[PDB]
Scaffold this active site. Sequence first.
Site, PDB file in Angstrom:
ATOM      1  N   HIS A  96       0.808  -1.219   0.000  1.00  0.00           N
ATOM      2  CA  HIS A  96       0.000   0.000   0.000  1.00  0.00           C
ATOM      3  C   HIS A  96       0.844   1.273   0.000  1.00  0.00           C
ATOM      4  CE1 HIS A  96       0.593   1.090   4.249  1.00  0.00           C
ATOM      5  NE2 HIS A  96       0.255  -0.131   4.625  1.00  0.00           N
ATOM      6  N   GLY A 115       3.213   5.787  10.195  1.00  0.00           N
ATOM      7  CA  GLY A 115       4.569   5.714   9.695  1.00  0.00           C
ATOM      8  C   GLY A 115       5.314   4.455  10.084  1.00  0.00           C
ATOM      9  N   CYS A 135       4.285   1.342   9.368  1.00  0.00           N
ATOM     10  CA  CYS A 135       4.053   0.232   8.447  1.00  0.00           C
ATOM     11  C   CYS A 135       5.371  -0.268   7.871  1.00  0.00           C
ATOM     12  CB  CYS A 135       3.115   0.655   7.312  1.00  0.00           C
ATOM     13  SG  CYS A 135       1.484   1.150   7.885  1.00  0.00           S
TER      14      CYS A 135
END
Lengths: 301, 301
Positions: free
Chosen positions: A41, A143, A145
């Site tokens: 993503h 932030g 991920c």
Amino acid sequence: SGFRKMAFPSGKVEGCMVQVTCGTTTLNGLWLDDVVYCPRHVICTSEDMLNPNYEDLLIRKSNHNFLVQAGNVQLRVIGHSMQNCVLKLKVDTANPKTPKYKFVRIQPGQTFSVLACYNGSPSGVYQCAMRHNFTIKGSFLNGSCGSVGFNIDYDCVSFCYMHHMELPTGVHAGTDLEGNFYGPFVDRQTAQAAGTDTTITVNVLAWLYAAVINGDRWFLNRFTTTLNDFNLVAMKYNYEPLTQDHVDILGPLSAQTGIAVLDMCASLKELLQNGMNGRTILGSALLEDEFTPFDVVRQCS
Amino acid sequence: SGFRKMAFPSGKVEGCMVQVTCGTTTLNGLWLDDVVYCPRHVICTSEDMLNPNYEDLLIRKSNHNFLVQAGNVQLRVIGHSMQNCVLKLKVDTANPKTPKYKFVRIQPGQTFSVLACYNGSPSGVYQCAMRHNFTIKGSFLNGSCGSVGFNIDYDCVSFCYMHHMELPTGVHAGTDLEGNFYGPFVDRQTAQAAGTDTTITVNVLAWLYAAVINGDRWFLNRFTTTLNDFNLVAMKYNYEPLTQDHVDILGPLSAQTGIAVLDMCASLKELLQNGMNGRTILGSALLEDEFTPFDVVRQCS
Ligand SMILES: Cc1ccc(NC(=O)c2ccc(CN3CCNCC3)cc2)cc1Nc1nc(-c2cccnc2)cs1
Ligand SMILES: Cc1ccc(NC(=O)c2ccc(CN3CCNCC3)cc2)cc1Nc1nc(-c2cccnc2)cs1
């Protein structure tokens, strides 16, 4: 003596964390040999969000769209491909700090260490368990991920979790390193929510054994129960059923303490039905279920 | 979202841990530049124990009596000296992995990460607080002496604790890296025991703010107390007195939540006088006091 939430030393993983930027989106990647792994993503743009098609979105990307930074050094992307929900970015440099590693998928009730990272920089390390509903109760801010979860066996890092998203109740969801989500979650905006959870019964029993190993004994009793009558009580309190295989896994702890598993189950039954009555076990006022039998043996012989 | 016991990433410290052997005694040392630091009781022999004189014992040692192993490489000792309760062993090789570092002594109520090591090999990492009686509630087995505690500020490791011993109640005692013990403890066999402890009040308040930041609000109330009437109640429950400086330190958390410190103190007073009544805060059934205001800000903005 003592018993703490303990994580594996994170040095071997710290040397693998990089920063991946696509447009205005930045998150963390895992650099092993000449490949960087990160959540797909990162290619999501604004007016997608709702119903994205990641196949379409990746077909529209070029290698130069991906900016990879390993500390103060930029890595050149020379290939890219989709691996389910993770992206694989081939770079022109093999990571000189690549440890011996495996990609392993864990089961609910098993634990792992999480190295939380922001902008490719490690921030902290903590210990998690995969819950029965395939979420983890982590500590993650926007932030984070691409942060990974792992165990270490001798010299080999077993990667088991990459962080992808936060659910409405504040719990966290992610994939294994092959990009396959844990649980029935997708990397897009839906009304998805965590299912119901249960208490990991074998882990609570492991932790009671750690308590006895450390000298906390007030909860012990002279009674023994059958595996059948114990599970009758466990269902009422939303504990997982206990199986014969769980009894065997607790064998070594049972042998070291001299307390048979079914004798410890009669202590757990009484704690459930009566509570703690103002006392603590290993500094906790509730029954802890995020320590496996292995965690206990490893920490306190 | 979420809130976990979180330790600093340990990689910078792992690269400093070595193994020090004297005769039949082996423990951990810290290798920085061309010096190895370890607990002086590594030179203790059997028929000493009771009343050792470490000055005499070190005068009788030679450099070749100390075997230092950095992984699979033996380091040659070329000098040795006593630094209070720690030994300084000069070696012929500067550690190529020496990070930027400082030796800092911490205060009760402050926290740090512990890298537990055995035979010079890191085993796990966890988070500790220095208690009011200058002990820490660690997790340490025989052979863990010389393990260190630390914080990290940007790129710089602040070493604050070296592990020396376990007290009868299972809590742990040690020194700063200048070799000065925390608290009234000595590195020999006496009847020494930990003094009485108190709850770190500013830390409990910090953790209640972390709870509100994470959406746990059931304990909040419309009431505000004075700093004087709060401390009247804190003494009855063995909490440390709250000062104006503590109020200022909680300023940023107070501003972010909109909850004045003295309003949160009226929630803490009610929790003390009434208990939790079956509910939990951030997954705990008791009030946690090992998170500083800094820990909270760092983990959950
Ligand atoms: C599952 C998923 C699908 C798609 C996305 N990406 C987006 O929604 C997105 C991506 C790009 C943009 C455009 N830009 C907007 C301005 N900032 C830069 C990006 C706007 C939105 C993120 C996720 N995962 C997320 N996890 C978190 C999160 C929050 C707290 C703790 N752990 C994870 C926030 S978003
Ligand atoms: C404070 C202190 C003073 C002196 C010593 N060293 C000894 O008592 C000692 C040293 C050498 C020997 C001789 N040999 C005996 C056989 N094994 C090899 C050594 C026997 C005893 C150790 C300590 N500290 C210790 N900390 C622990 C400990 C246990 C669990 C968790 N954390 C620390 C055990 S001993």
